[PDB]
Amino acid sequence: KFPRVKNWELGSITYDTLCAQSQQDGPCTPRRCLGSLVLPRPAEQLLSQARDFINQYYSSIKRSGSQAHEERLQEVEAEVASTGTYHLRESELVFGAKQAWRNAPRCVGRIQWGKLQVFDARDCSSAQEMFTYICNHIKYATNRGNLRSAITVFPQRAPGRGDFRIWNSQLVRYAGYRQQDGSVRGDPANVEITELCIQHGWTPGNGRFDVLPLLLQAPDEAPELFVLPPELVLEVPLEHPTLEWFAALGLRWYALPAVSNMLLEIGGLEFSAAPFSGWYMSTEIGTRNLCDPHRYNILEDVAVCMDLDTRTTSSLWKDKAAVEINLAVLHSFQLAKVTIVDHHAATVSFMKHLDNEQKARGGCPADWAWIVPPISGSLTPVFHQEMVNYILSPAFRYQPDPW
Amino acid sequence: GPKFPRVKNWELGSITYDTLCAQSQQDGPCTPRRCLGSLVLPRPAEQLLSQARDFINQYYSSIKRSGSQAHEERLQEVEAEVASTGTYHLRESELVFGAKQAWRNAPRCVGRIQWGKLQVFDARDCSSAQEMFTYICNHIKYATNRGNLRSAITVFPQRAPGRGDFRIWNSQLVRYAGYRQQDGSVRGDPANVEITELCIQHGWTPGNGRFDVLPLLLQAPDEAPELFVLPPELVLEVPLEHPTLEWFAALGLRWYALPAVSNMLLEIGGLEFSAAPFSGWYMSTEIGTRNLCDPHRYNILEDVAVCMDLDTRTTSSLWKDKAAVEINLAVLHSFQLAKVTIVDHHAATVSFMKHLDNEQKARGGCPADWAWIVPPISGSLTPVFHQEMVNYILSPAFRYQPDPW
Ligand code: HEM
Numbered sequence: 001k002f003p004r005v006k007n008w009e010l011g012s013i014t015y016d017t018l019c020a021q022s023q024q025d026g027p028c029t030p031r032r033c034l035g036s037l038v039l040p041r042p043a044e045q046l047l048s049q050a051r052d053f054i055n056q057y058y059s060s061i062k063r064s065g066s067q068a069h070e071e072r073l074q075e076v077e078a079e080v081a082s083t084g085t086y087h088l089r090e091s092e093l094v095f096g097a098k099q100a101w102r103n104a105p106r107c108v109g110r111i112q113w114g115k116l117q118v119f120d121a122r123d124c125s126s127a128q129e130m131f132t133y134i135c136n137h138i139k140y141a142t143n144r145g146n147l148r149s150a151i152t153v154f155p156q157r158a159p160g161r162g163d164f165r166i167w168n169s170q171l172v173r174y175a176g177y178r179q180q181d182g183s184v185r186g187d188p189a190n191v192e193i194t195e196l197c198i199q200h201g202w203t204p205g206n207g208r209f210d211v212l213p214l215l216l217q218a219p220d221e222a223p224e225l226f227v228l229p230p231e232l233v234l235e236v237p238l239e240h241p242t243l244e245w246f247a248a249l250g251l252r253w254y255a256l257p258a259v260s261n262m263l264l265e266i267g268g269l270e271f272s273a274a275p276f277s278g279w280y281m282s283t284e285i286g287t288r289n290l291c292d293p294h295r296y297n298i299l300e301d302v303a304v305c306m307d308l309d310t311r312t313t314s315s316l317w318k319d320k321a322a323v324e325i326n327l328a329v330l331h332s333f334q335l336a337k338v339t340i341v342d343h344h345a346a347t348v349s350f351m352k353h354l355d356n357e358q359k360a361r362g363g364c365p366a367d368w369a370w371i372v373p374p375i376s377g378s379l380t381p382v383f384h385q386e387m388v389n390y391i392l393s394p395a396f397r398y399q400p401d402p403w
Numbered sequence: 404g405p406k407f408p409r410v411k412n413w414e415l416g417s418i419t420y421d422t423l424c425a426q427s428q429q430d431g432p433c434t435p436r437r438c439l440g441s442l443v444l445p446r447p448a449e450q451l452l453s454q455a456r457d458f459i460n461q462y463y464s465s466i467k468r469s470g471s472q473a474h475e476e477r478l479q480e481v482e483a484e485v486a487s488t489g490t491y492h493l494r495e496s497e498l499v500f501g502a503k504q505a506w507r508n509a510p511r512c513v514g515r516i517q518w519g520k521l522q523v524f525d526a527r528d529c530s531s532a533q534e535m536f537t538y539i540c541n542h543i544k545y546a547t548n549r550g551n552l553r554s555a556i557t558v559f560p561q562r563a564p565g566r567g568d569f570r571i572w573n574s575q576l577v578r579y580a581g582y583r584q585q586d587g588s589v590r591g592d593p594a595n596v597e598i599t600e601l602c603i604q605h606g607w608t609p610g611n612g613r614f615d616v617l618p619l620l621l622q623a624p625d626e627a628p629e630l631f632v633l634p635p636e637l638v639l640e641v642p643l644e645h646p647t648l649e650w651f652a653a654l655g656l657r658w659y660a661l662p663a664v665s666n667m668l669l670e671i672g673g674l675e676f677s678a679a680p681f682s683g684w685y686m687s688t689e690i691g692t693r694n695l696c697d698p699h700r701y702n703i704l705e706d707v708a709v710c711m712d713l714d715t716r717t718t719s720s721l722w723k724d725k726a727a728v729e730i731n732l733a734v735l736h737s738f739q740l741a742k743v744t745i746v747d748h749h750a751a752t753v754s755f756m757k758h759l760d761n762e763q764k765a766r767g768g769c770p771a772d773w774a775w776i777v778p779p780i781s782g783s784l785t786p787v788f789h790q791e792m793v794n795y796i797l798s799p800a801f802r803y804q805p806d807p808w
Pocket residue numbers: 101104106107108109110112116149150151276277278279280281284341346370396
């Protein structure tokens with residue numbers, strides 16, 4: 001019934017009762033845990049989700065069971081009964097979006113969940129307009145390096161008509177150019193989106209860090225290409241506090257992590273284009289982006305620069321280099337005055353978040369494999385913390401590529 | 404298409420489906436409503452017969468004699484015995500098979516590529532705590548093999564109806580004392596404060612150091628536990644030093660060569676072996692990262708970073724990470740110098756990938772606990788990090804069992 005959750009470093013125990021609020025099943029069954037998989041494969045439905053969400057709204061403002069609450073419940077009844085769907089009021093949308101971040105079990109930054117700038121772009125009718133809204137988002141969220149978390153919510157989905165979509169997986173992304181030699185110049189994760197941009201008429205560059213254009217799609221239309229004005233995209237040259245040669249590698253990364261391919265579900269309405277951004281955790285760039293073998297794969301290069309025995313796993317040249325790379329990322333960002341959090345600082349804040357949520361809701365959904373950083377896992381206190389995973393709504397969902 | 408979990412490796416983009424999980428005859432802690440996959444501890448008439456029937460079938464399959472006369476006769480024999488004594492007994496080769504099979508089946512063990520190479524010492528004749536001591540000494544001798552470590556297990560007599568258990572009170576055959584201090588701190592290993600205290604209560608004269616080898620608390624059926632001291636020539640230890648940081652040897656850190664779990668239950672065809680200590684060789688992260696750096700263990704991260712002249716005042720100097728790497732490097736280096744088997748987390752994980760491929764061929768899946776397979780340092784630097792894994796309970800199995808006190 002109520003799962004007991006232990007911290008093995010401190011011996012402290014809690015119980016999770018938040019999890020009974022889960023209405024949507026996950027991948028696990030008593031027979032097998034699929035906790036580690038990245039993704040598994042009427043108008044009563046929508047009405048109860050809407051009721052439930054409205055309740056969570058009026059409760060959150062301590063106006064639960066009062067008049068405005070009843071008359072807004074009726075408003076929805078009346079809208080679905082007539083049109084099979086309904087619309088949200090701006091502040092309710094502001095509630096959902098925040099709450100969808102709060103509920104994101106794979107997110108280590110949720111201490112921040114309350115601080116979210118929310119742009120209503122539901123009055124969008126063209127890719128043209130989408131681009132404008134996307135551009136104000138980037139400008140707002142960047143703030144010359146003092147990054148501020150934002151979301152922009154484009155118009156909701158609708159029965160028998162195409163979705164508004166952002167084809168790009170993030171708003172700022174580096175091209176992947178499939179070379180003759182079968183190698184990849186640029187970022188390998190983006191080979192395919194790079195190819196679509198080119199198919200839709202973009203003139204490519206030939207560098208390792210070419211900011212990709214956006215492919216924006218308004219309902220039932222071919223997507224349209226838009227180039228991000230290069231002065232909007234803040235970038236950070238990478239260099240190392242003590243290693244003088246690192247900078248020559250000409251390595252760099254963009255300041256703004258902004259997801260743009262995820263669906264936002266609130267009270268049963270679905271928002272198919274609803275990009276959000278906060279700030280980077282250094283390990284995302286220093287460990288995964290630069291060090292994954294199927295990414296920029298810079299480990300060996302760097303270790304050879306460092307002059308390490310590469311001929312053997314037992315010298316730990318991988319672990320040594322990986323650390324220098326992460327350090328170079330932190331230093332560089334801190335030097336260019338651009339918000340970044342290290343994995344130690346981030347997981348410390350996460351632990352306090354678990355605590356706040358414990359008092360606030362009786363738990364916190366959390367995905368241990370995603371919350372523990374890609375290096376030095378057991379050196380952070382999340383490593384020792386048991387965690388319960390489950391789906392609460394409002395939620396972000398993964399959605400399949402629009403092509 | 405397939406009616407089974409799909410399993411993807413995100414580095415190579417390769418796909419497999421786990422069909423072995425259909426074999427699982429025991430439920431874990433997850434439900435469709437919520438995943439409890441990271442809990443360390445999750446919360447007989449016909450029953451025995453069917454577990455027994457299943458294991459026998461497993462044994463006859465492994466010898467490619469499924470359906471044969473010896474097979475149905477062994478089944479008949481086992482039923483005859485249960486429907487008479489309420490229990491039954493494994494043949495020698497059945498025990499060797501179930502033991503290897505339990506190691507094969509263990510989701511949390513990264514070292515399973517070695518599963519087929521296990522020395523199984525039978526000790527189901529053992530009848531006193533003195534004799535347990537003897538068996539254990541023999542085991543340690545054999546497994547340590549002067550540094551050239553060899554996987555082994557020693558099986559003591561099974562649970563009986565109306566007879567007490569064989570038990571090794573110690574969680575490991577070799578562990579350091581943890582002495583609770585005047586000032587609240589712990590000298591030694593804080594993991595072992597209780598067992599240390601229990602040893603002194605049962606008569607041990609304690610030492611006063613950070614690395615004192617504990618004595619054994621051994622419990623024959625229905626008796627008080629008797630205390631036994633391992634002769635020091637039997638416990639191989641490695642003094643720790645760094646390849647280049649010269650001051651590291653001056654810390655007087657050290658570890659023992661033989662990781663030997665001693666408190667686990669070994670379940671085979673429903674029979675329960677409450678005392679069946681098993682050992683292999685260390686992966687270097689266990690010593691260098693968990694034992695030496697956990698805040699609730701030796702906790703040497705700060706001492707070392709100070710020596711390294713790092714900025715411990717701020718997180719973003721990655722002082723924790725830099726020191727942790729050296730400590731790990733010193734573990735590897737010192738074991739390698741002293742000629743004691745060890746495997747670094749890179750090589751260990753590569754070979755587990757290879758173990759996954761083999762098992763995919765042989766059984767159609769491999770139960771594995773992601774959070775336990777991925778090493779505590781440099782996680783995504785290892786191929787296991789990008790491998791999805793299905794976790795489920797197969798039997799034969801090893802289970803955690805509560806302390807006997
Ligand atoms: C404010 C600073 C933030 C930090 C430091 C942070 C950190 C992270 C990290 C490290 C991940 C794992 C990323 C990976 O390995 O791919 C993640 C995932 C996630 N974050 Fe946060 N995040 C932040 C803000 C936000 C914001 C503003 C939102 C939404 C408004 C958000 C929603 C999510 C979601 C939905 C995921 C799941 C990723 C997926 O399934 O693709 N995060 N976050």
